[PDB]
Amino acid sequence: KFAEHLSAHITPEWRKQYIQYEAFKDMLYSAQDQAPSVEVTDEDTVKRYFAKFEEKFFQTCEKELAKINTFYSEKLAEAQRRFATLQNELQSSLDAQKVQHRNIKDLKLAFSEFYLSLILLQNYQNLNFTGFRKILKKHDKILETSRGADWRVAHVEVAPFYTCKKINQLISETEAVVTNE
């Protein structure tokens, strides 16, 4: 069902920029399918096979996360620029008044297109975060490990596509923890 949900909620223009969730599901199937059974091979070849798969899997995770961070950051910087342009265009139109009804009409359109771009970007953030959490839980369930959950905490939960931390905030927060403990 999540593969369906993700597919239905994707912004078509951004399709290639989302977590390749079905490809990860397929990857995990092939890992189970191609798995050498111990009794048909020794304990060391099984460990080496899964070790090899783990490297491929987490390199794909890193590649997917890099893609998501890049796209999100580019879109977020573009959003902050557009918001500044729009606020300046608005103030200049407002000051001008004290016929430009068609001027404001173009701005109403501009703010509408902009707000939508923000909602679409928030959806992309939420869908991608859910996609990572779920695929890593799937990985962990199948491979009977905690490496996926470790990777979620280490790289996804602190990713720029997901969360925002001003260096000043992180400094005041560390000050607080240190002075109080």
Swiss-Prot record:
Side of membrane Cytoplasmic, spans: 1-181
A GO molecular-function descriptor: inositol hexakisphosphate binding
Superkingdom of origin: Eukaryota
Phenotypic consequence of K134A: Decreases phosphate efflux. Decreases phosphate efflux
Domain SPX: 1-181
UniProt keyword list: Cell membrane, Disease variant, Membrane, Phosphoprotein, Transmembrane, Transmembrane helix
GO cellular component, one term: plasma membrane
Tissues where the protein occurs: Widely expressed. Detected in spleen, lymph node, thymus, leukocytes, bone marrow, heart, kidney, pancreas and skeletal muscle.
SS bonds (residue pairs): none
Mutagenesis or variant effect for L116P: In IBGC6; phosphate efflux is impaired; present at the plasma membrane
Primary location group: membrane
Region (Important for inositol polyphosphate binding): 134-141
Keyword Phosphoprotein applies: yes
Cellular compartment(s): Cell membrane
Record remark: domains: The SPX domain plays a role in the regulation of phosphate flux. Inositol hexakisphosphate (Ins6P) is bound between two SPX domains of the homodimer. The SPX domain has high affinity for inositol polyphosphates and its affinity for inorganic phosphate is two to three orders of magnitude lower.
Known function: Inorganic ion transporter that mediates phosphate ion export across plasma membrane. Plays a major role in phosphate homeostasis, preventing intracellular phosphate accumulation and possible calcium phosphate precipitation, ultimately preserving calcium signaling. Binds inositol hexakisphosphate (Ins6P) and similar inositol polyphosphates, such as 5-diphospho-inositol pentakisphosphate (5-InsP7), which are important intracellular signaling molecules involved in regulation of phosphate flux.
The family this protein is said to belong to: Belongs to the SYG1 (TC 2.A.94) family.
Quaternary structure and partners: Homodimer.
Disease linkage: Basal ganglia calcification, idiopathic, 6: A form of basal ganglia calcification, an autosomal dominant condition characterized by symmetric calcification in the basal ganglia and other brain regions. Affected individuals can either be asymptomatic or show a wide spectrum of neuropsychiatric symptoms, including parkinsonism, dystonia, tremor, ataxia, dementia, psychosis, seizures, and chronic headache. Serum levels of calcium, phosphate, alkaline phosphatase and parathyroid hormone are normal.
Protein name stated in the entry: Solute carrier family 53 member 1
Organism: Homo sapiens
Taxonomy of the source species: Eukaryota, Metazoa, Chordata, Craniata, Vertebrata
Gene name per UniProt: XPR1
